[PDB]
Write a structure and sequence with these properties.
It is classed as apoptosis. The protein is mainly alpha-helical and about 160 residues long. It has helices at about 5-25, 30-50, 50-60, 65-80, 85-100, 105-130, 135-140, 145-160. The protein has one domain: Blc2-like (Apoptosis Regulator Bcl-x, Orthogonal Bundle), CATH 1.10.437.10. About 75% of the residues lie in helices and about 0% in strands. Helix 2 crosses helix 7. The chain starts with a helix and ends with a helix.
């Protein structure tokens, strides 16, 4: 079921992989909720793509160690010990941005593993408490593409600054 850790990891990999192919390994087949989730992540990422302060900040991380900056940003976004879906979206979106800079190639799988490792270690308990990824569906329903973007862009920009 969708609260099983194994299902959460699998759906998470699929959402992350499918999301990284938007902004820029074979697509194992998908379900109905996960299709709705992929469409939503695409919409948010397009909206985040046009958030100018966010893009200015992402352009500001001159990163010779993508792993260093990635774990510093993921930790900082969660360093208060709380969780919410906006931070998760921020995490996925930032991983996709690191992929884009690497387009100068095996890093897709590398960066995906960083994100799923952070997901498993730091986030899985909270997602279980949410009922699984359906929690994220609700988060997109309770709001507006343009409204949720403000908050995702807010958490990601704040974290990129500390670094």
């Amino acid at each position: 079921g969708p609260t099983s850790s194994e299902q959460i990891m699998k759906t998470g990999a699929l959402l992350l992989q499918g999301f990284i192919q938007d902004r820029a390994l074979d697509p194992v087949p998908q379900d109905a909720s996960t299709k709705k989730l992929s469409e939503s992540l695409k919409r948010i990422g397009d909206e985040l793509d046009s958030n100018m302060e966010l893009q200015r900040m992402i352009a500001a991380v001159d990163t010779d160690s993508p792993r260093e900056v990635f774990f510093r940003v993921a930790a900082d976004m969660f360093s208060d010990g709380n969780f919410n879906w906006g931070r998760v979206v921020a995490l996925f979106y930032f991983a996709s941005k690191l992929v884009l800079k690497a387009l100068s190639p095996e890093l897709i799988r590398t960066i995906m593993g960083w994100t799923l490792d952070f997901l498993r270690e730091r986030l899985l308990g909270w997602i279980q408490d949410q009922g699984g990824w359906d929690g994220l569906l609700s988060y997109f329903g309770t709001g507006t593409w343009q409204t949720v973007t403000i908050f995702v862009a807010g958490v990601l920009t704040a974290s990129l600054t500390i670094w």
